[PDB]
């Protein structure tokens, strides 16, 4: 449950406001990953203001961005890296029965920083 994840986030020392959290889940190695509303510097608002048009063009509404990004980073398979080959990890994921690649940067505390689609 989200309530159990919040208790676990709390005991690991993450300081957060529940109403700011828009996604939280564990990846396959047990790391808690979470996404907050954020601002232009990080989090959901950073994803939307930078790359929101990508989602619009593939038919993913703005309201679905949290679930789509969260599924990629917690359930997806790393298939490469952006930057010079050691930057943001690229996750192979599934959206509505179709394969996409979504790159996601996460902090050491599990906070989702930024994300983008790839071709």
């Amino acid at each position: 449950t989200t309530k159990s994840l919040f208790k676990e986030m709390t005991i690991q020392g993450i300081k957060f406001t529940p109403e700011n959290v828009v996604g939280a889940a564990k990846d396959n190695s047990g790391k808690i990953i979470f996404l907050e509303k954020g601002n232009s510097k990080s989090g959901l608002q950073h994803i939307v203001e930078e790359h929101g048009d990508q989602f619009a063009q593939i038919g993913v509404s703005e309201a679905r961005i949290p679930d789509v990004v969260m599924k990629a980073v917690t359930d997806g398979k790393i298939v490469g890296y952006q930057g010079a080959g050691a930057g943001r990890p690229i996750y192979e994921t599934m959206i509505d029965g179709k394969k996409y690649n979504i790159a996601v940067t996460v902090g050491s505390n599990g906070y989702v920083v930024g994300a983008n689609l790839r071709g």
Binding site: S40, S42, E49, Q82, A84, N116, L117, R118
Partner: protein, 98 residues
């Protein structure tokens, strides 16, 4: 015709495709531009990466309002140089908001 978006994002190259076929970051080495401009674009991206607080990313930011202004100012100038070097075969659009 190809659109190229100049925009810094953490741990990415600062250049982006804008159609579903070419979404994702683009290495400056993939473009027909001067070594000097490639190096300048990578120096600008490095400045943005430096604002990331990796242990507590909600705290990310420039050291001052003036440092952010200088970063945005420099991005405008790089976008204009990029459009000049690429000519009319490319459309450069600068993402100015950080």
């Amino acid at each position: 015709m190809k659109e190229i978006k100049l925009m810094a994002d953490y741990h990415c190259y600062p250049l982006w495709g804008t159609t579903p076929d070419d979404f994702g970051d683009i290495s400056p080495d993939e473009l027909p531009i001067s070594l000097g401009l490639k190096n300048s674009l990578e120096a600008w991206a490095k400045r943005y990466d430096a604002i990331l607080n990796t242990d507590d990313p909600a705290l990310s930011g420039f050291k001052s309002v003036e440092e952010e202004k200088l970063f945005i100012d420099d991005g405008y100038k790089l976008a204009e140089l990029l459009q000049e070097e690429l000519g009319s075969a490319y459309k450069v659009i600068y993402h100015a908001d950080y």
